[PDB]
Design a protein around this ligand. Sequence first.
Ligand SMILES: O=P(O)(O)O[C@H]1[C@H](OP(=O)(O)O)[C@@H](OP(=O)(O)O)[C@H](OP(=O)(O)O)[C@@H](OP(=O)(O)O)[C@H]1OP(=O)(O)O
Ligand SMILES: O=P(O)(O)O[C@H]1[C@H](OP(=O)(O)O)[C@@H](OP(=O)(O)O)[C@H](OP(=O)(O)O)[C@@H](OP(=O)(O)O)[C@H]1OP(=O)(O)O
Lengths: 222, 222, 222, 222
Amino acid sequence: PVQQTGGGNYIHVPLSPRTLNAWVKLVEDKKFGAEVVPGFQALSEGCTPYDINQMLNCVGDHQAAMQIIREIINDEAADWDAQHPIPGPLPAGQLRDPRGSDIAGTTSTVEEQIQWMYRPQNPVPVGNIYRRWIQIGLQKCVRMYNPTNILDVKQGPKEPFQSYVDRFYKSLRAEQTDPAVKNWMTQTLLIQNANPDCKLVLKGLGMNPTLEEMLTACQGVG
Amino acid sequence: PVQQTGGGNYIHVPLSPRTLNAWVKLVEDKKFGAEVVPGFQALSEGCTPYDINQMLNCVGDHQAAMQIIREIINDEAADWDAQHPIPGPLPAGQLRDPRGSDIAGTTSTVEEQIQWMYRPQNPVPVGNIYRRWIQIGLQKCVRMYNPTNILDVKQGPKEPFQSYVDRFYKSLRAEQTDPAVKNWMTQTLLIQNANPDCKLVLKGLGMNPTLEEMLTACQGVG
Amino acid sequence: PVQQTGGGNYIHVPLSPRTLNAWVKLVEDKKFGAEVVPGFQALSEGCTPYDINQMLNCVGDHQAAMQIIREIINDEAADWDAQHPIPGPLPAGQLRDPRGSDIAGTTSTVEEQIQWMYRPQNPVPVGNIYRRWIQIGLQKCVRMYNPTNILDVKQGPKEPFQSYVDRFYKSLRAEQTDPAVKNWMTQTLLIQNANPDCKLVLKGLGMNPTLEEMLTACQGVG
Amino acid sequence: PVQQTGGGNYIHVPLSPRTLNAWVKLVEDKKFGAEVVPGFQALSEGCTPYDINQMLNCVGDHQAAMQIIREIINDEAADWDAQHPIPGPLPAGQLRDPRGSDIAGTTSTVEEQIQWMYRPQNPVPVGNIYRRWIQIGLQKCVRMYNPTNILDVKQGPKEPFQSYVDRFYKSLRAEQTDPAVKNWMTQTLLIQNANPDCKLVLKGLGMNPTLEEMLTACQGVG
Ligand SMILES: O=P(O)(O)O[C@H]1[C@H](OP(=O)(O)O)[C@@H](OP(=O)(O)O)[C@H](OP(=O)(O)O)[C@@H](OP(=O)(O)O)[C@H]1OP(=O)(O)O
Ligand SMILES: O=P(O)(O)O[C@H]1[C@H](OP(=O)(O)O)[C@@H](OP(=O)(O)O)[C@H](OP(=O)(O)O)[C@@H](OP(=O)(O)O)[C@H]1OP(=O)(O)O
């Protein structure tokens, strides 16, 4: 992370060992589950690219997922090296502008990452861009390791409607389908895959029942 | 959060990553359960509106609940923009007074939030007002996702009276009913929905038995 | 319909009784089924609005569907009376420009409909605009009377994969859902709702199998 | 279609609505079955490319099959734009020669299609070339939707030999296999997949029995 010091300059404070150990624990227990994507973001907040590399280096043993996060990073960096091209011959005595690889931290020092992150002129938020690239990689890992598909989720005959709602929305988090497909699933598939009685109360509510109206109506049905 | 520095001025210290990661964990495990409302308050204590937005941004994937917390915030801000109207033409060189949107932090910088929070003259506690608005939103989410209704809760034939009391009061926390309805439930419904024997001992106690007297009397009955 | 005669002018030839009787038969046998929408278009080709009214008048007894086709026509005419407003004071000795009601034929003679349909200057195709409005009305009737929902369709244990494909696509024709939802259903729901064996061969094909590849692979499976 | 008028010139008479409605019915009932290919040819006889487009536009809802007929048309037009290249700079006051797209009618007026179809010099039969391209597309649709494969067809123990012959030849119509494979199937597979008794009478006939000899011999066997 970065702390400001007297003179208006900034320095690097290494991520706490227990901040790194929390990340490890999460990846070892949730197995790249939907929750890992937000868990990574909260534990990587205010981090330079250098620190994000260490967090990944602490969870490298999960090689399959790391290979997926690594192929997504290279592509989001290539797109940065195509749409943010070298401006031209950089003047001497000046830091080069960041390339996709600098945003990652692989070809750049943490100080360079800090100089960009806090440029008085055109600050480049290299830490947040790289966290966004890794979140695309982790979300692809959440989908690949997702244990139950949205379609398979079906309310148990006795299962309370809210727990069936809880499992239905958790699988939808993994789904990478178009947002309209997500809206049609929450409005059509969720009434389609409910136990016989809850299905009669939901159809009873009428057309386009909101989730609050559906949860309120099926509370204690079954 | 806010730390005071030499000169009598205040600065902003970003919420710790592990303070943010605790919030995520809670929302991912308690599923907007009654406990989330107090858990949010303890982890948002001494926060500017800016920080409260980040905590919410770390739990955005729970879109249904976030939509409910977001509709409650807009209404508590509209009521602030009606009962705390722009005083009139603000003098130049002065910070504008906060509007419902400034209390949220959406249309305002953290420094402005800090200047109000610590105004030498008429300090506006924007952080606490916004936490109160979100607590109304989370409490509506606790009620919507509540799995068991107060009425359905019924003591098991062998269930110890205290565990039946524990489940009865946990559902009452979710209930948004008038306080008198809450007092009549704790004094009438709790004796009505007890296993046959405990019901005879409670009626034996007499009229208006206190909870302590009821727990003491039914200890070891069944 | 319209025939051209010597002098460069056009006249009206009444729709054949057996062209009208075919329409009746279809509506009496397919019961506003998906097939009725194309059947109407083929039997209403080259028709003035006047003729389209008679076809509808021959199937008026189906009052519920006619009320739906009539509410859709009034709205598509109101939108025409808002986006194609009276240009201004029409000069004397000239036919007024068509309004939503003229496109229908209700407030206009067939000759006026023909004069517009074949205007040397800015011909307005009133017959085709009204056929399009009625097709929106019939398609809403196809959806309302659709007997099986896309989701319910599930391949029989012995049913050949192609017949299950035939029923799956016929229900999709009735579906008015967004096109992406239609693409996700044909690529995901169609493999999800197949009998156990065909489901194993389809997953065997790999990711994004085309319909031809799926029909070829499951031919004779079961 | 095209009618000749006084002066030696030709004009276009729009395909009858009931000629178009027959086509619709067939495609809606035979589901792109082998019979659709001949049914299309008889109902498209003496048609300009313009009319053939309308027939297809009346059966567009069958999107999967239409996509197959559309990919076959583009390829048969590309082959026409490669083997029948623009002759060179066309003289002014003259109709351009037809390209694959003109044969389809997509980039050409019906009058141009008629001028070519009835050129006094080098008439190009654009209507028949496009019908041939669509027949390749429909035949691919017959094969894709074919419900029973030639190999699977096996005479029922009681099924009369002629009905088994009827099903065997109907599946062979769908088969796109080399003609020799078609001759070997009709001479070997048809005796191989007959019920035990008919198989003994057919082997009894001797080597290379004609279909007439086989039908005559197995009449009333079983
Ligand atoms: O809530 P606490 O009583 O303070 O316990 C905390 C809590 O762990 P648990 O709540 O799951 O028991 C911390 O996690 P937070 O909820 O505060 O975010 C965790 O710190 P981590 O972020 O690293 O997980 C820390 O565990 P540890 O000390 O192993 O780092 C642990 O403190 P104690 O276990 O010492 O009570
Ligand atoms: O194919 P055909 O031998 O000419 O029979 C036709 C055919 O009806 P069917 O094919 O269903 O038996 C006509 O329909 P098309 O397929 O030609 O479009 C139909 O005319 P409609 O369009 O009005 O249905 C007409 O029936 P009808 O004479 O009652 O009008 C009928 O002719 P026949 O029944 O006299 O043989």
